[PDB]
């Protein structure tokens, strides 16, 4: 179809890191959306559904309070400003492993050439082990 679209994914081999990946089955880069420096490039002005999900996993809890945070940023072409659009926080800890997912979703108007960044603070805590657990995506509407 004709709308700018992306659904991209964490990279299974990417070593302990969040690397957004469209070369995959059931993954999308289309209609001018580019993946540049691990960010989504908005090809045109409009309204975009933006969404991301990360799934964190620990084995047990180390002795610090852990704050897992997951964030989608808009880098505006002209101003060159990084700004929070979507952010959520989780606090997993207070033998056996734990799993905290985070979902982010929303509708904003984006200028052509704007960039979207899906990022988290602790890549050591990231589980992409099976598929569909870590993904970044937008489609214009």
């Amino acid at each position, epitope marked *: 179809s004709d709308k700018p679209v992306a659904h991209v994914v964490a990279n299974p081999q990417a070593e*302990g*890191q969040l690397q957004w990946l469209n070369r995959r089955a059931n993954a999308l880069l289309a209609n001018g959306v580019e993946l*540049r*420096d691990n960010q989504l490039v908005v090809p045109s002005e409009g309204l975009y559904l933006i969404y991301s999900q990360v799934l964190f996993k620990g084995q047990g809890c180390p002795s*610090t309070h852990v*704050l897992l*945070t997951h*964030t989608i940023s808009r*880098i505006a*072409v*002209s*101003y*060159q*400003t*990084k700004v929070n659009l979507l952010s959520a926080i989780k606090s997993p800890c207070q033998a056996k492993p734990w799993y905290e997912p985070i979902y982010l979703g929303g509708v904003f108007q984006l200028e052509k050439g704007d*960039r979207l960044s899906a*990022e*988290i*603070n*602790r*890549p*050591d805590y990231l589980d992409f082990a099976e598929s569909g657990q870590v993904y970044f995506g937008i489609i214009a509407l």
Partner: antibody, heavy 118, light 108 residues
């Protein structure tokens, strides 16, 4: 591989004028702003200013305001630091470092040492 | 102009030791704070941004923390190559400002 390579520095004489070039490679140069940071010989880090590479507008620290000026050649992916009326006190390693507006600095130029000396 | 004051101004520790350096900001900068590592006569290497976020390819033993005014950088297990000076920086408002640096020397 993102690379900021700097040059232009070295000996100058007081009251003098120098231009520094930060030549960027490995990224889209206008996708990020550029920061200028100078560090005295063995002291800490001082932030001189930031320039938007897309629209070309800089921002200066109050001390450096106007006595230094930033500019660009976009088409060759290089950012400039023009330095004038240099005093011995100005001796420093000058750094270019990539970053958005009012944000952190991910990549730093290797730095180049300016010596203001008679 | 926002002050950033790191403590200690330098420390010794053995390899394997947990190491904390703390940064306190003269005003509330929120989470807009970053940590840098400068090995001697090298450029600074960006470690952490927005106070807890890790930069890619930076070892896990590094964890940044805090919000408000007080912030702490933490090396989980100190390594021989972590020998460096570390600078907190606040980007909340202009001008950007750096801590004074904290020397980390290894005991052996």
């Amino acid at each position: 591989e993102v690379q900021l390579v700097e040059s232009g520095g070295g000996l100058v004489q007081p009251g003098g004028s120098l231009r520094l070039s930060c030549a960027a490679s490995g990224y889209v140069f206008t996708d990020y702003g550029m920061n200028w940071v100078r560090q005295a010989p063995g002291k800490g880090l001082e932030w001189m200013g930031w320039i938007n590479t897309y629209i070309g507008e800089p921002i200066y620290a109050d001390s450096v305001k106007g006595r230094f000026t930033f500019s660009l050649d976009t088409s060759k992916s290089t950012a400039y630091l023009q330095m004038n009326s240099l005093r011995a006190e100005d001796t420093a390693v000058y750094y270019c470092a990539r970053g958005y507006r009012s944000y952190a600095m991910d990549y730093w130029g290797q730095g180049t040492l300016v010596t203001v000396s008679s | 102009d926002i002050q950033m004051t790191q403590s200690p101004s330098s420390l010794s520790a053995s390899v394997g030791d947990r190491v904390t350096i703390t940064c306190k900001a003269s005003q509330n900068v929120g989470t807009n704070v970053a940590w840098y590592q400068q090995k001697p006569g090298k450029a600074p290497k960006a470690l952490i941004y927005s106070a807890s976020f890790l930069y890619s390819g930076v070892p896990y033993r590094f964890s940044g923390s805090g919000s408000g005014t007080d912030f702490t950088l933490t090396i989980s297990s100190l390594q021989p190559e972590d020998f460096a000076t570390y600078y907190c920086q606040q980007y909340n408002i202009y001008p950007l400002t750096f801590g004074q640096g904290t020397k980390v020397e290894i005991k052996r």
